[PDB]
């Protein structure tokens, strides 16, 4: 612990060898113990500024980061014939309510006092679980629970046929047809497209599927009432064949153009009636019909900081899906610019999610291929909610004034979520509308109203209670750097679209300066509170990530996807991404977590992001959350190549190496033991590649040593040096 000040200029080794743990709100031992899980609900200031003035004086942003539908281990399910809720602000009776007349309860959010209905009340599960899930009553639905409908929309143009993604995508569906979320009411559908929209009907009465083609691009329509969206259960055999055929129907195609717009417009109309999930796969820039985008020239490391969408079409179409509880997930496997800065909008406002795969090719990029294999595996077998919505409430005086995430904000905080995934992240920014002089505790509650794949209406609520403070140092003592960082990120993304990448970048540098600069006018070197010791380190890495970096040869579509991830990713993976974890692995040992019964699991220490830490004499794994990159030294140890890599010498370490071998060696067991534990800490299986040779021309590994200097960026010390110069100007 510690209320110590730190001089960033003399330490230079502040980053701990163990994972960082989320702060603990300064709260009475008994309340904190019932507090929500931080991995689900968390605040930037565990210590809430009693007043806005105090909030500003700190110069830190006040907001929340949530991951509500996240996969849980033990989820309490209340089937209460009635849901207990405050008659004024409609807050879900939670663990942080104040019980008095033991037959009445004071709403912790708007202080009104409610009458406990005749249905030890404080022992009721509703008030012993911060994270709970209620069964929605007949009033909580505007229509029979809609069934699960999955419509895939493939782009079958020439380019698209050349990448050969269609093949794997279909094998996945096939291997995971049975594993799709849903009862017997499950509906599935398909549509292909190039210059025309290709529908496919499936009746058990006909010898083979029927490809129905719409060619009037300026006026689409559905070709058949029935059979286009079939009943998986009944039609299993039928669909199974279609998947085994499609990849083969377009091998000698000469269609260069692709009218994605119309396709989607038809995609929409088919779903319109039921709503459901629209999985769209695209591979190039849209050039036919509406939704058409003009090509653009990719920037080089030379051009300065001089993003937004080319047209509104995809956004407009999105709200429409949204109003139909239709969600669109974008899978881009383009090899050239494709204008994601505008395509993304399709998924951004429909609470969908975009998946990117740069230069996807069945033969030419064995990496992306697996990445996809594995991200589809996820996307396909993970739980899903339908026609859901979310509201976030917070104690009187506190106000959410800005949202971050893929959803549509109807009337303040009725976030419409056409679809809800357990990988979707969200953030919010609040301010003090009224001074918290009254209370000494404020709570936040988010309810997730939705429809399970099993046709059940359900609410998922999380509730968080924190303490109000009235002195700077306090605000500072409970600061959560990580969260401040990720929240700033989202504000920056928006900052860039609203203005420019420059301002975005700057405002990020000013958060650090205006902050520590405020800390000083309130206390030689760069002096900061123990909690913000990693504040400049994270913003820097923030400025060097592919979402804000500048001096690089970064292509448009990439930058955009990067900011798409900041926007739709749960703090934890924004960190992994932004600040990979570097572990030296050629010498793992026994200080491991050899607890897990028969497996030991080494616990090597986390290194800071710099080449000064690497060593030609060894191997270093870098965990970036989505992928694991094993860089290897030229002068490595023989033992490592032979007993871990399965090779006789550095020179014969296969160029692209997609995964280590499972050799009968204790060195193998150890490295495989470590790697296995890492991926078990997440649902999205991260690929791993050792291709990181010292000459595989895939050493983008180095792009992560955020602490060194570059011809176009400052070093950590260089950054610290700059900050201090402004802190005391």
């Amino acid at each position: 612990e510690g209320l110590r000040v730190v001089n960033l200029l003399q330490e230079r080794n502040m980053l701990p060898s163990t994972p960082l743990k989320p702060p603990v709100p300064n709260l009475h031992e008994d309340i904190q113990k019932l507090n929500c899980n931080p991995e689900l609900f968390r605040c930037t200031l565990t210590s809430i500024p009693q007043t806005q003035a105090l909030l500003n004086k700190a110069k830190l942003p006040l907001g929340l980061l949530l991951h509500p539908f996240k996969d849980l281990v033990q989820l309490p399910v209340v089937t209460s014939s009635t849901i207990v809720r405050c008659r004024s602000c409609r807050t879900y009776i939670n663990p942080f309510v104040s019980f008095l007349d033991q037959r009445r309860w004071k709403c912790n959010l708007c202080y009104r006092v409610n009458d406990v209905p005749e249905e030890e009340p404080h022992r009721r599960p509703e008030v012993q679980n911060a994270t709970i899930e209620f069964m929605a009553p007949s009033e909580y639905m505007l229509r029979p629970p809609q069934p699960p409908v999955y419509l895939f929309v493939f782009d079958v143009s020439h380019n698209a046929v050349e990448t050969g993604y269609l093949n794997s995508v279909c094998q996945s569906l096939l291997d995971n047809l049975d594993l799709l979320p849903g009862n017997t009411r499950t509906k599935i559908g398909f549509i292909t497209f190039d210059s025309t929209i290709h529908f496919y009907g499936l009746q058990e009465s006909l010898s083979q599927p029927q490809m129905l083609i719409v060619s009037d691009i300026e006026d689409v329509f559905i070709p058949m009432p029935e059979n286009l969206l079939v009943n998986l259960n009944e039609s299993k055999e039928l669909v199974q064949d279609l998947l085994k055929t499609l990849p083969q129907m377009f091998t000698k195609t000469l269609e260069t153009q692709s009218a994605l717009g119309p396709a989607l417009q038809a995609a929409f109309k088919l779903m319109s009636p039921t709503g459901g999930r629209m999985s769209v796969f695209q591979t190039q820039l849209p050039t036919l019909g509406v939704g058409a985008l003009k090509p653009r020239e990719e920037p080089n490391h030379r051009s300065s900081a001089k993003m937004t969408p080319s047209t509104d079409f995809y956004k407009k179409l999105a709200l429409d899906c949204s109003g139909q509880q239709v969600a669109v997930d974008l899978f881009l496997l383009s090899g050239q610019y494709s204008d994601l800065a505008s395509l993304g909008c399709i998924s951004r406002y429909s609470a969908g999610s975009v998946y990117y795969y740069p230069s996807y090719h069945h033969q030419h990029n064995p990496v992306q291929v697996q990445k996809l294999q594995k991200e589809l595996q996820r996307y396909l077998t993970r739980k899903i909610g339908f026609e859901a919505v979310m509201r976030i409430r917070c104690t009187k005086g506190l106000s959410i004034h800005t949202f971050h995430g893929n959803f549509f904000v109807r009337s303040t905080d009725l976030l419409s979520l056409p679809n809800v995934n357990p990988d979707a992240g969200y953030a919010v920014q609040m301010s003090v509308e009224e001074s918290l002089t009254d209370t000494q505790l404020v709570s936040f509650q988010s309810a997730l109203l939705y429809t399970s794949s099993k046709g059940e209406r359900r609410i998922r609520v999380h509730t968080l209670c924190l303490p109000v403070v009235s002195t700077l140092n306090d605000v500072f003592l409970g600061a959560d750097v990580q969260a401040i960082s990720g929240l700033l990120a989202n504000m920056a993304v928006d900052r860039s679209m609203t203005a420019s990448l420059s301002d975005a970048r700057d405002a990020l540098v000013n958060a650090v300066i205006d902050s520590l600069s405020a800390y000083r006018s309130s206390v030689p070197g760069l002096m900061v509170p123990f909690s913000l010791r990693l504040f400049p380190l994270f913003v820097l890495a923030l400025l060097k990530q592919k979402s804000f970096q500048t001096g690089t040869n970064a292509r448009l579509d990439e930058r955009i996807f990067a900011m798409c991830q900041v926007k739709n990713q749960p703090l934890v993976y924004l960190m992994l991404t932004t600040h990979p974890s570097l572990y030296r692995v050629d010498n793992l040992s026994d200080e491991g977590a050899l607890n897990i019964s028969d497996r030991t699991i080494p616990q090597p220490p986390i290194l800071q992001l710099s080449v000064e830490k690497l060593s030609r004499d060894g191997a270093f794994l870098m965990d970036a959350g989505s992928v694991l990159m094993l860089w290897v030294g030229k002068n490595c140890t023989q033992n490592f190549l032979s007993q871990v890599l399965g090779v006789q010498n550095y020179a014969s370490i296969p160029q692209p190496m997609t995964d280590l071998p499972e050799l009968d060696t204790p060195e193998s067991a150890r490295i495989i033991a470590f790697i296995s534990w890492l991926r078990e800490q997440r649902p999205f299986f991260p690929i791993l590649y050792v291709i990181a040779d010292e000459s595989p021309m895939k050493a983008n590994f180095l792009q992560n040593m955020i602490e060194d200097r570059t011809e176009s960026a400052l070093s950590y010390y260089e950054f610290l040096l700059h900050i201090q110069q402004q802190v005391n100007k």
Binding site: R85, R90, A136, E139, M141, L414
Partner: peptide
């Protein structure tokens, strides 16, 4: 407004 049910 299914959540707030007001």
């Amino acid at each position: 407004a299914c959540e707030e049910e007001n």
